[PDB]
Each structure stands twice: as C-alpha cells, then as structure tokens.
Amino acid sequence: QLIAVDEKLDITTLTGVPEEHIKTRKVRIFVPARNNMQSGVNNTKKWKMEFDTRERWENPLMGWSSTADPLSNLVLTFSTKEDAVAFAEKNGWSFDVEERKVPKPKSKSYGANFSWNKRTRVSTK
Amino acid sequence: LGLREIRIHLCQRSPGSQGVRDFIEKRYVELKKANPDLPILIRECSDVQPKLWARYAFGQEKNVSLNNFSADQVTRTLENVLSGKA
Amino acid sequence: SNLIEVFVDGQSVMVEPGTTVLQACEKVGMQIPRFCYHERLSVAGNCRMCLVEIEKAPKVVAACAMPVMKGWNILTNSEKSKKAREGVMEFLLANHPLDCPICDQGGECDLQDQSMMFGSDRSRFLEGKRAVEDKNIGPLVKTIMTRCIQCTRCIRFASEIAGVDDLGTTGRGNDMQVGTYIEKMFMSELSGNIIDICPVGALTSKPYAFTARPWETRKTESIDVMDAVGSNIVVSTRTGEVMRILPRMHEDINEEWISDKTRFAYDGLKRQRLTQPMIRNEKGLLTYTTWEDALSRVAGMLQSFQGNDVAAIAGGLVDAEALVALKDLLNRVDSDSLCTEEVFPTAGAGTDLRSNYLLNTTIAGVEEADVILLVGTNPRFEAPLFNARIRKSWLHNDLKVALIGSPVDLTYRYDHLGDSPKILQDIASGNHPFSQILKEAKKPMVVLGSSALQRSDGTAILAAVSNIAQNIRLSSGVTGDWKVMNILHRIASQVAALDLGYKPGVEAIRKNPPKVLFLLGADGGCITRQDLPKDCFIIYQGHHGDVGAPMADVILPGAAYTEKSATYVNTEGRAQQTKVAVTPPGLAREDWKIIRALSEIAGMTLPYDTLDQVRSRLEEVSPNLVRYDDVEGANYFQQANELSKLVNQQLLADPLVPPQLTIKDFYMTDSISRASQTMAKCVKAVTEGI
Amino acid sequence: TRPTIRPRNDVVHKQLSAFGQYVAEILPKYVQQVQVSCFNELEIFIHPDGVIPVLTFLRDHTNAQFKSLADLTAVDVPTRQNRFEIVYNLLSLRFNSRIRVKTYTDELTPIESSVTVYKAANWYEREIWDMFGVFFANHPDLRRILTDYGFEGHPFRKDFPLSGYVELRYDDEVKRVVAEPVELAQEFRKFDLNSPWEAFPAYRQPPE
Amino acid sequence: PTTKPPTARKYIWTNHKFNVSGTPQQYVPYSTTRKKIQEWVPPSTPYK
Amino acid sequence: GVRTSPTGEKVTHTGQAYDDGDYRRVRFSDRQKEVNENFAIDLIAEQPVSEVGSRVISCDGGGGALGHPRVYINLDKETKTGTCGYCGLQFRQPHH
Amino acid sequence: GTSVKPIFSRDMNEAKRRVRELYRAWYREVPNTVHLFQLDISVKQGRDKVREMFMKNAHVTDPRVVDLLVIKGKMELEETINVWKQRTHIMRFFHETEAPRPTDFLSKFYVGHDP
C-alpha cells in the first residue's frame, strides 16, 4: 500500500552538501557549442550541467593554480533538457537553461559556381 | 513630489495591453508634445501584466497596474500622475 | 509537398530537391567524413574524403556535391565506402609531415581524428616526402605550408566571405602550392577565420602558438564586447588564465566568424590593468590604498554634494548591471546627469521609443532585403559581421547596395551617391533616381551609422533619414511587418544605457559642470579637466589604465568582460549575458558590487544584494533586459517620425567622413585593444608592409 | 577476421538465449527484459518488487542452481527518473554458467534486502548504502562500511565532487585532528578528451 | 667503465655530487615562469 | 649563457628572477637557487649550418630511432636557412 | 496519487513520533558522551548542539525524507554510543578551528569574490 505524498521532490537534506554550495551556486544547462577548430559534431549531442566559475589563484610555491570550490570540475551529462532541469530542482540548485542551437539547413549547389549571370560564379577552384 | 520620469511597460500582443497599445498609437504624440522635457520610456513586457512607473525625487518611484485598462483609463492615470494627485 | 523520398541505409528520408547526399545523411544523424566541404563556402569536391556508395551503382559518388535522386539508397558503412575512405586517407597521409608533437593542431586536428576513425592504422609509403617553403601573410596567421592538404577552404573563404582575392594556387600536380605567389599580407578584419576553417595546422594562430593544448583548456561561452554586434564567442582558459578566443555558432548574429579585434585583442587584458584602489597623496600622486579608505573618501564627497553637482559618464564597455547601479546611486542623490560618450539625437521622441535607435531589420533580416542604403557609416570597420552579412546577401541574393559618405572599400561593389549630406534631402524630395529605386523595392533598407550621429548636425541627419523612410512607407505602401529604419551602433554599452534612460551624449555635463564626476569606464576623452571647475572630484571605475585614469582622484578597479557574468545589449536590441571565465585580478571587484558597496558606505543602501536581484531591478526598469535571446519588438516609427518633424535643425556643408577610413584605424578603438601588443603589431604591419 | 579479432561462441549464445526465455516464461510478473550480449553474457531486467522472488528462484530451482552471489553493486545515472541501477551477478557451479539480474530505484524508494537469499549480500548492501544512499529494507545491520565516521554524503554519486567537501589536518591549539573545507594547492585539471567524430556507427542513436 | 668508457658530451657534469639534502646546497623549488598580469603605472607628475 | 640580475640572483634560461622587492627571495636564504648553466639556445646557436646539394633535406636528430620523428625540410629560400622543428639544426644550399 | 512506496511512516505524524523518539535517545545519550569521550564542553552545550542539528532540518515536509533523516540520526547515535567515533568526530560538530565567516555584503566585498 502506498502513501500518496503531494509535495515536490527535494533531497537537499540528504546529500551532505554544505549550505554555501546549495544556495549560492548557479548551474548552467546547455548543449555545448561545436569546437570551431573542427567539423565533427559528435560532442554536441547531449545536455551538460556545469557550475559557475569561482576564484583561482597562484600557489606561493611552484606557482601552481589553486582553488577552493569543490564543484569546479563537476560536469553532468543528460539526454534531455527536462532531465537536467529536474535534477537541478531536486538538488536545490538555481539554474539557467539555454535553448539548443541547431545549424539551419542550407542550399548547396555545385552548378552555382559557374553561373551565367549571377554573382555566385567563382573566379578560382 | 518632483516627477522625474515615466515608464510604461506594455506587452506587444497580450489581450490585457490593448488599451495601452491604443493609447500609445493615438495620443502618445500629443502627450510627449505636452511634456517635451519629460522622459516617457516605452518598454515591452513579457506576458505577466502591464504596469506604469513614475519616478520622483531622490529615487522614490511608484507603480500602478494598467491591466485591462482602456485608452481613456490610461489617459486618466497619466494625467493624474503628471499633476498633483495621489 | 515537393519532397522526394530517399533511403540512408534503408531508412526513408524526405528531402527537398537539390539536397546533396551529405545533407540527406546528416538528416538521419550521420556525419560524412569531409575535408574540403564547408557548409558556408562553395562546394569544391577536391579532397574526395566524402566518397560514398549508392546501391546498384558501380562507382562511388562525392556526397558533398552530388544531389540525391529519388529512390536512392545511400550505403554509408558498406565495404566500398570504407575502402574508399581508407585509400583517400592513405593518399592524404603519404606526404604529410610527422609534425604532430610540434603542430598546434594536435589534439583538435580533423586529419588526426578522421585517420583514427576512417583510415587504416599503418603506412606502406616507402618513398621520401615533399617539403615546401613557407609564406609570410602577416603577423596574425602563422603559416607552415608543408601541413597543407590542398583543401582550398582558405581560398574560398577569402574570395567569398572576406571579399579578398589575394589567395590562390600556383603550379600543378604534386607541386601545387597554396599562397599569394608574392610577398603579400592577408590583412583583413575577418582574416583570422582562415585559421579556424583550415582543417590542419598549415594555418595557425601566431599569438597563440605553442602555449596550450586543446584538451587542457576549459571552455567558457560568453559574448564579445569589442563592437555592438554581440558576436557569440568561447573563451579558452587554462589554470586561471585566458588562452584564446574562439567563435561560437549563432546563426542570427555572426554564424561562425568573428572579427580580428574580437579574436586577437584578448592579450590586452593582461596589460595596464587596474588591480588596487588608488587615491591622491599630499604630492598629488596616485597611491595604493585599501577599499575601505577609497570608498570612505568617495562616500564623503558624495554626501558633501547633491543634485546637479553630481554626474556620471559611461564608457563603451559598461554592462547593464553597473549602469543601473550607478543610475540608482545618483538618483538617490537626486541627480539625473547619467550620460554616455556616444551621442544620439534627443530631439523628438529621442530615447523614449526603443525602435528609434535600433537595428530594426535585424542582422538576419539583411538576407531578405532587396535594396540597402548606408548613410555616413563604414560597416566594414564599425561592424565587421554586419558587413559580412551584407556581402553574403549581396553574393547570394544580388542585393542592391548604395552608400552616402566617403567612398571606402566595403569588399563588395556599391553605388557611391556622394558624401554631401544634402543627398538625403534630394532623395527624400524625389529629385534623385535612388528615390525611385527605393520606391520600387519590395524590401528596402536604410541604415544610418551611429558614427555620423556624432556630429553637431546629427539630429538633422536623423530627421532626413527618417523622412526618407517615411516616404518609402507611404509610397510603396505597407509590406506587412518589414522595418526600413535602422540604426547601426558601434559601442557595446550604448543600447543598454539608452534602454535604462541614460542621456545620450555628454551635453548635460557641459551645460552644468558638476562638482563630482563618476567615470564608469569612460576612456574617450570627451571631457578633460578643462571642461570642469577647479577642485573637481573625479572618480574613475574601470579595469585598464587609459586616458580616463590619470586625471581621477580615486581609482576603483573593476572587472573586464571576461571576468563577470554581465548583460550587454546588441545593436539589434538583443540582450545577452556573458559568463565568468576568470576572476578579476588583484583587488578588482565586480562593478555593480563596487557601486552597491559604495551606496552602503554612504548610507543610501540600494535594495539589492545579489546578481539575481540586480537583474530583477533591471526587469523593473526595462523588462527586455532579462529576455536573453529575444530580438522582437514593437514598431513605433510613425510616432518617432511625427515627433522628429517638430524641429528643423540645419545640415552642415561638411562631407560625411567615418572615423575609420582604412584598416590601420580599425585595430585600436577602445581601452582593451589599445593595451594589446598584437594590435600594435597589426598596426605596424599595415602601416609599412616589409 | 582471424588473428586480431575476438572469436565468437554461438553455442553459448543460443544456450543463454534459451535459458533467458525459460526464466522470462517462468516469472512473467517481474521480468521486463532479457538480453544476451555478443560476448555471451545473460542479463535479466526485473521490477523492483521481484528482487526476492527472482533471486530465490534462481538460487533454489533445480534447473538454475545459482548458489553463489558473485557481486552486488549500483550504477548512478543522473539522467534517469530512477537514478540507481542495482546489479546482481550470480554464478552457478552445477551448470558452469553466470547470470546478471538488474533492477532500479531512486533516492527515496527502498529496495528489499537479500540477506535471506544470500548471506554475502550483507556487506554488499552496506557498501551500496554507504556509496550511493540506497536504503535496504529489513537489513539486519545497515550502517557505513567504507567511509569515515560521521561522513556526510554518498561519494559514488555522479554529482559528488571528486575531492569531496572537507579535508583533514592536525591542529595544535585543540590538540586533535580537525576537518576543514577543502583547499587544493593545485586544482585537478579537467581534460576534454572526447573526439568530435563518431567512433561506432553500430550504436548510433536516432536524431530525435 | 674502464674497458667501456661512457660517451663524452660537453653538457655532462665533470664532477659528481652526492645527495645534498640537509645542506645549504639543497634544492629549493621555485616557479620558473614570468609574471602574467602587468599593472598600470600611474604618472609620476601632478595632474593640476 | 647565465646572467645575474642587479640584485645578484642568477637569471635562468626562462628569464625569471625575483623582483628586488619580492618576499619570495627568502626561500633561498641559508640555501641556494637551482639554476642549470647549459643554456640550450646558446648551445644550438654554436652549431654550424650544414651545406647540402639538394632542395629538400631529411633530419631525424641523429642516432636513427634514438632521435626524433624524421622530417623533410625545404631549402629553396636563399635568404634564410632551413631549421629543424625538432632539433634546431640548420641546413642550406651552396651559394656565393 | 503519485504512487510512492513508503519507508517507515504513512504520513508526517508517525515521522514526527520517530523524530521525537530519536531526540529523546540523543538527549539521554549526551551526558554519557560527555563523560566517556572526556569532552571539555558541558552537557548543556551538547544538548544545544543536538537541538541545533535537529532544527537544521525543520523545514522538511516529505515523510520519506524525514524517515531517512531519522535513520541517519540513529546511525550516528549508534556510532557515538559504541565509541566507534573518537573525540575528533564528536568535536567536528562544533567547528572550533574554522574562523567565523562574515555574512554582511561589505565584508564579503572586502575579503573576495564569493557571493
């Protein structure tokens, strides 16, 4: 037999996260943009969740890069935007969602390179 | 008591902003020609509600809902704000 | 409809006529291997990597150039296609140099990845390799032509997108070489994109050379502020340091291109930086101090004076959050002297109607226009991506382009009506043939540059251009919802400041010299201390040491656009927000945080404490500033025109001359690019060739 | 094929498919899917209510005789409504075969304890609770097994940071070891290794 | 190394040194790179 | 090619020396600063340019498989010598 | 209906009763913890800390979350009673070596960039 709870899901008290990293964090939900250096598009299929960037400073010894926020490397992968939104809500994180950008279909025509009167005619191959 | 600026936030195609759209289309020109040195900012809202903002001296500002108002009611509200009322 | 039916590995696909095999394959989620094909360039068909087998066809076809026929079954993973890919990759790698450890392309090389995915794992080439000599094409693009695979992507981009026909091929056979055949520099505002389009490390970024590898860089998607275009960019950071700037694809703004100032001026963020608060000592010299002391001095001077005696000037790189913060701070003093350096005519509707100072047609709307008239602007150097879109629609839609102003080179051919401003009156009255040309156009476009508005007779020019637009509206009838009036801005902060109620221009400060002046990133030299009374208190809040800083009494170090999550408004009117890539250096702080702390120190605390509350305040002032991709807005051209007919200020007998006439004036236009050594190298190269 | 390619075994494939059909027929109330992988591993997907009956049947049936529990673990997939995938690995010594039973749960739905079926499940369930936060009902003694005393959070969840939230050091003023928020002299460097080109067309998903 | 001497190089140490830990010759680590961010230098002259 | 700063600190091959007002100097007190004295740029600058009679030369760094990946260098320009991107050796065609 | 399986309690009242029982057990245990671990705090401090930890989760309205919190509290109490915890673990509840971080806007602005 079931109990029929009627409140929205909240698991913040069970995750062991400090209060600072629940109420002051901002997560971004987005599909990563294609690396413009390459033409492959396999890295633009899923949704990502990442946290806001915090301070990094030089270590007095070795001049290394130091950090104090534990979430600086946490990246989650989701199959849909709604799954990421639900995860963020049940974890109590304030989120910003960016709509997926898809390149528009384009009209390519090899014969247009050699037009009789149009400007699309190419001067070299 | 010194009026500094007027802000009118009307949504572009919501039903509740039809009166504000009519007012801006018809009498905004004469309203601006009556007050050549008064900033009357016309900005667009998302579908929540229409509103009007009046800013007074020292950063005090007041807001009033213009939702479902007609052009005549918008004119009444603006002439009340522009004069020594409320 | 007109769609035909094709199959990709036996799966039905409905495509438009003229669709290529590659596009049909990508409709079902497969990417055909490619080297020479770029969807924004013309089809070349030379690399032959995209060869694919069609069922019941003995010979493989080039998927990038071949339109797909109805009933075709594309077999993308058959033995024929795989062996063709392996053979093509073998031929590509036969002469390629073993330069991967020293090549900057390593780790993000299409040749490497497609060899790993579609090629074999070993070599059977037992001969010697070919080596070619390098070409010097400028201080921006590093050239190692032995890595060239002869794709010709760079040549097509130079010819079609950049409008420069300086690149080509010389020789033939194995000896064919890509270059200029002479010592010549490929110096263009869009020249840096050939590095991105090049699949291999033949063309690489010279400022970025050897510094980092692709896998260690962290990607921060942000917005460019070097102009009013608002190009989407990616900031590459490693270990808390900005490494390079890459374009981010936005179809409606910049596609996948950025200007050279956008790409190579990031190194100016590492020089002449304000890191600590500064005050004046007893010798009149600037001395380091804590935030407490500087804020206390500023708060004391703020409490001492009131009203008209307090003023603020906003610079070209100011975000909306700091703008509204400073506006609220001076409003609590009962001061309305919130001004920008860029001048916009206040006569008539002025800033009241948002469409009066916007690119109403939008950047993507340029592709629909039949005729465009440019008045007093050099779009090539004022908005490089807007000019690129103009050339794109000129090439692909036979767009008719005219110009009023100095006859500058726009990388496309146009009709030069002249530089005298009376041509506007002649066109409006109908005494000009271009009046009829505009009358008979289906989608006319008129663009007035904000640089021409920086004249004493700017209001007259705006009135004349609005009269031309009104004549077009009345004569050609109503096209539906098509906007003819457009304002092209060059300053990233201008539209956001105008949306908030800032007074355009700095006339209000000359009308009433203030005792206390806030320089919020103002580095244009609009007002020096000669325009101000003695003992004037000048406060400069910014991130660089530029002309504004040394005449201030208190210096408040702020954050650069790469160091804050901040909102900027586009020339189109589209609000966009940046992200934090690194944090401000030293003691520098977020700008709105500085203003809020100052307000609290002075006792007139602002109601907001967090960035979400700052954006809620922005929504309270102007709701369009929290719609982060909306570009839609109401059209109020009729009211603005009627209000602009009220005053009849006269034109001057001065030919319209844009501030930028040649490439040398393009590189250094703001505080960040003036501190950039790469921009200095660019100016040195364009000034004398050598 | 030959020298470099792993050979196939069709006989084991058919045997495992037949036994999966057998098990699915015997327990239609709980079995949702049966899969055989190409390297001959049998997987049975069940409803969470069937954890005890299915495991009991696989242990005690004459034709199954899966008397050994090889392993029991959990997998965290944040994108699913039911976050946690519970995996049982069983071995049959009578028939020289292995089987995998899989179910699901979320953060708040308990799973039945299997200590009555397999005594080995005690510490495995304790570790699942410690690392993932999945509660097991009727567990004789459920408590942390791997983490420090008083440790907050479940480290093996995908959203738990790799370095955690607190670090330890000795403090001389209080003369004891204290816990403080983590600061790293060198931050772990995140690498983006995935190629933008697809590797395996046989696993391509529909473009939605 | 008498019958098979090592290969002579101009950069090879001619004098071997033992473990120098605990001595004033001990290795002290330090960052080997240059300063990354350059600060603006205020003018040295009065401004009025 | 070691060089000393106006403070007396040896400048390394990477050019890093602490500013006279830098507190991080204190780590070298009662101790030393480790500096390698064989500057590679000067060492490679001493190597003579090899004269070869072909338009393209091959370099693997010497030692066969004990060097670097084998690359081919074009030598058509008489204005400048052909430098190996791995080893730094220089090659040129006979002129004068 | 939302069709959710319970853990222990049907609704919030039984969850509250379990919370009260756990609070009673902790309140009884505190003096024994002070004696056994040789803590320098007083019994009042320990009971105030227990009250603070209980009130930390006062906003929870989901009975399943309350049940899981009670389960975790019982685990912590079982660790404390059996002396599986050491003095360091008990004193970690007090954060005696962490500096008090200010909350006002001006102090955060002065110290750094964190909101």
Ligand code: SF4
């Ligand atoms: S271009 Fe690509 S394949 Fe050629 S050397 Fe550079 S990284 Fe290697």
Ligand code: SF4
């Ligand atoms: S330089 Fe790059 S883009 Fe140009 S032909 Fe060579 S490989 Fe192609």
Ligand code: FES
């Ligand atoms: S991609 Fe088609 S031949 Fe190059």
Ligand SMILES: [Mg+2]
């Ligand atoms: Mg390249």
Ligand SMILES: [Zn+2]
């Ligand atoms: Zn070499």
